[PDB]
Each structure stands twice: as structure tokens, then as C-alpha cells.
């Protein structure tokens, strides 16, 4: 497969402010979504999802085709409770109806780091709506209960070396675990809508216990009331994770700067962008506009 992307048609920088523009201020106003985090931590883990789908090999999946879209994607099991982050979109979707699904669902978590107070991500637009025979098949997402090789060989696959994988990590700052849509229960720390380099600082500082959770799967859990999955936890038992983790909790500056690279990459791959398309766009905030 080649995935060419191809601006939607007449539309300018001026254009995907005004989106947004839009999933901010809905951001601003729906803020007691899941006790008072809001949506921003949901919609980074959707872009991320429909970007985790792409394999390197075939260059099928990715986020430039919309696939989440559809029913097959959509019900698979390791998407359980991003219905809320493609609900929130929806209204915003049917007021800008020119905007292709991949380019919405990827400026959503453009839109929440930014708003939450991380890195500028630089974007561009141009992915193409393809139909539902190119939606990938269930189960290329990554397990949970599994260790830092299991990790490494995963993200090899969308082409990921090991600071890129740490950097990416450093969202579970973000949000939290809910027993119900993945079977662990717990948040990664305090500020959890506010991005900052707080996943790091717990990884290395906190005491984490082992237990099983009420779902009977395994997740470290800290006397401070947070916990870590064994996916992250991996990352201070592998000697080379474990030198860029500190390497973070000691520069959050290196990590916002490495976090936008790996996250603008991420969205970005299976994607070819001819050398007559736009500059990557960096969109203002609602702040920087008064707004
Ligand atoms: C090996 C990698 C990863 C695994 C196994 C993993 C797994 C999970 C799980 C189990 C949840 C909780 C889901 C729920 O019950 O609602 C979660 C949440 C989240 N993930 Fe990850 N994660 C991984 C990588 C990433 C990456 C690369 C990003 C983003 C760049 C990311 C961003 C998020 C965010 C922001 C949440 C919070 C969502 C919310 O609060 O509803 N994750 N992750």
C-alpha cells in the first residue's frame, strides 16, 4: 500500500484552527467527564489507537484511512471506552463536515496535549477516508501483562526505538486505568490532566507493591494511591529504559521536546506527504488567542 495524503480540498491553516478552536472550547466546557479529569486524557489514548493499528511490513493500519470508524474496529476489545473520546468528536465532526475522520481523530489528541498544558505537536493535515475493507483486523494493539522485551518487539513494528518507546510511555501521566474497559483499576499519579513529567517521577520514586486487583490481573499499586501496569513497570527493570526515565524525571524540557518528535511521528506513519504539501501546521491555544 501507498497512503498519499491529499489536502481537503480549499482548505488552509485558517481552517484547521477553527477545529481546533472548537474541540478546546467543548474541552473547557465538559470538565467533569470520569470525576473532574475531563476529556483531554481519552482523546490522546484514541489518536494513539488509530495510530498503533499500522504495521511496517504491509503498511496496513495506521491513522490515515478513519478505520475506527467502522463497526469491526470500533468493538474491538483493547478500544473498550474510547466510545466516549468518539462521542465527544461527533458534534464537533457534523459542524466542520469537510474534515476527514483520520485528520479529526488525530487533532483531538493534538488538541488535548496542547490544552493540557504540554508541547506544541506540529501537524499536518491531508489523511483520506478509505472504505471498510481496509479496516485492520482486531489484536494488533499491545497486552498489559507482559514484560520490557514484550515491549521493544512491540513497538518495532510501527517502528519505534527505545527513546521514542519512553517518551510515548510518559502520556500515562494522563488519565487513568478503569477496571471495567481493561480489567486494572488506578490512576499513574496526582496532576492527572496536566502533562508534565510526573510518570517518571513516580516510576523512580514511589514504593510499589504487587498485588492482583479486583479483576485478578496483576498491577503494582504505591502507598500514595497510584499504580502501574506491568508494561510500565518494565521500564526501570530494563537497563536501557531505565537510563532515559531518569533521564526525564530528571529534564521535563527534554522529555516535552522528545514526547512531540515520537507523538507527531506516531500519528504520522504509513503516511506519504508529496513535497508540494503544506508545512506542518503549528496551532495557537485558546490562550495565546484570548479565547
Ligand atoms: C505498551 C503500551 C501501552 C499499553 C499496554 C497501554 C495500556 C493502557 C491501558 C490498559 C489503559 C487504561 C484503559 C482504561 O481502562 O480506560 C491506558 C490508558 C491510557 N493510555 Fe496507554 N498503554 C500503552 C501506551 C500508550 C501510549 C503510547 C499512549 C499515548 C501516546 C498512551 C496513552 C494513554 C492515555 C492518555 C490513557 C488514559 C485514558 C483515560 O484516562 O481514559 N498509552 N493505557
Redesign the pocket.
Same mark, same amino acid.
Not at 35 to 60: E, F, M
Not at 136 to 164: C, H, I, S
Given at each position: 500500500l501507498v497512503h498519499v495524503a491529499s489536502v481537503e480540498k480549499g482548505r488552509s491553516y485558517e481552517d484547521f484552527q477553527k477545529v481546533y478552536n472548537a474541540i478546546a472550547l467543548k474541552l473547557r466546557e465538559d470538565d467533569e467527564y470520569?470525576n473532574y479529569?475531563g476529556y483531554g486524557?481519552?482523546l490522546?489514548?484514541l489518536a494513539?489507537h488509530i495510530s498503533?493499528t499500522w504495521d511496517k511490513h504491509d503498511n496496513t493500519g495506521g491513522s490515515y484511512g478513519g478505520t475506527y470508524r467502522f463497526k469491526k474496529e470500533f468493538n474491538d476489545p483493547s478500544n !473498550?471506552?474510547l466510545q466516549n473520546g468518539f462521542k465527544f468528536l461527533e458534534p464537533i465532526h457534523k459542524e466542520f463536515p469537510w474534515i476527514s475522520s483520520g485528520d479529526l481523530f488525530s487533532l483531538g489528541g493534538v488538541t488535548a496535549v496542547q490544552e493540557m498544558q504540554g508541547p506544541k505537536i506540529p501537524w499536518r493535515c491531508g489523511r483520506v477516508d478509505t472504505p471498510e475493507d481496509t479496516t485492520p483486523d482486531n489484536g494488533r494493539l499491545?497486552?498489559?501483562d507482559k514484560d520490557a522485551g514484550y515491549?521493544r518487539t512491540?513497538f518495532q513494528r510501527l517502528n519505534m526505538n527505545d527513546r521514542e518507546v519512553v517518551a =510515548?510511555?510518559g !502520556?500515562?501521566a =494522563?488519565? %487513568? +486505568?478503569? =477496571? %471495567?474497559?481493561?480489567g486494572?483499576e488506578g490512576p499513574w499519579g496526582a496532576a492527572n490532566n496536566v502533562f508534565t513529567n510526573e510518570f517518571y517521577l513516580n516510576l523512580l520514586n514511589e514504593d510499589w507493591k504487587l498485588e492482583k486487583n479486583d479483576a485478578n490481573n496483576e498491577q503494582w499499586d504505591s502507598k500514595s494511591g497510584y499504580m502501574m =501496569?506491568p +508494561?510500565d513497570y518494565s521500564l526501570i527493570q530494563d537497563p536501557k529504559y531505565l537510563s532515559i526515565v531518569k533521564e526525564y524525571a530528571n529534564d521535563q524540557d527534554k522529555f516535552f521536546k522528545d514526547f512531540s518528535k515520537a507523538?507527531e511521528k506516531?500519528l504520522e506513519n504509513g503516511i506519504t506527504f508529496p513535497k508540494d504539501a503544506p508545512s506542518p501546521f503549528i496551532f495557537k491555544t485558546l490562550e495565546e488567542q484570548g479565547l
Amino acid at each position: 500500500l501507498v497512503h498519499v495524503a491529499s489536502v481537503e480540498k480549499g482548505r488552509s491553516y485558517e481552517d484547521f484552527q477553527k477545529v481546533y478552536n472548537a474541540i478546546a472550547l467543548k474541552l473547557r466546557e465538559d470538565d467533569e467527564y470520569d470525576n473532574y479529569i475531563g476529556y483531554g486524557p481519552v482523546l490522546v489514548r484514541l489518536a494513539w489507537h488509530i495510530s498503533g493499528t499500522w504495521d511496517k511490513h504491509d503498511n496496513t493500519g495506521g491513522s490515515y484511512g478513519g478505520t475506527y470508524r467502522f463497526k469491526k474496529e470500533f468493538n474491538d476489545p483493547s478500544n !473498550a471506552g474510547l466510545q466516549n473520546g468518539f462521542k465527544f468528536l461527533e458534534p464537533i465532526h457534523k459542524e466542520f463536515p469537510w474534515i476527514s475522520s483520520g485528520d479529526l481523530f488525530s487533532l483531538g489528541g493534538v488538541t488535548a496535549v496542547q490544552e493540557m498544558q504540554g508541547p506544541k505537536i506540529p501537524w499536518r493535515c491531508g489523511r483520506v477516508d478509505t472504505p471498510e475493507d481496509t479496516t485492520p483486523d482486531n489484536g494488533r494493539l499491545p497486552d498489559m501483562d507482559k514484560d520490557a522485551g514484550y515491549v521493544r518487539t512491540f513497538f518495532q513494528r510501527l517502528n519505534m526505538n527505545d527513546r521514542e518507546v519512553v517518551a =510515548l510511555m510518559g !502520556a500515562h501521566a =494522563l488519565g %487513568k +486505568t478503569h =477496571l %471495567k474497559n481493561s480489567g486494572y483499576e488506578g490512576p499513574w499519579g496526582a496532576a492527572n490532566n496536566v502533562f508534565t513529567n510526573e510518570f517518571y517521577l513516580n516510576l523512580l520514586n514511589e514504593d510499589w507493591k504487587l498485588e492482583k486487583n479486583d479483576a485478578n490481573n496483576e498491577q503494582w499499586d504505591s502507598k500514595s494511591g497510584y499504580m502501574m =501496569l506491568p +508494561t510500565d513497570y518494565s521500564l526501570i527493570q530494563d537497563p536501557k529504559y531505565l537510563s532515559i526515565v531518569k533521564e526525564y524525571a530528571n529534564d521535563q524540557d527534554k522529555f516535552f521536546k522528545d514526547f512531540s518528535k515520537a507523538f507527531e511521528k506516531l500519528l504520522e506513519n504509513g503516511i506519504t506527504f508529496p513535497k508540494d504539501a503544506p508545512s506542518p501546521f503549528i496551532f495557537k491555544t485558546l490562550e495565546e488567542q484570548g479565547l
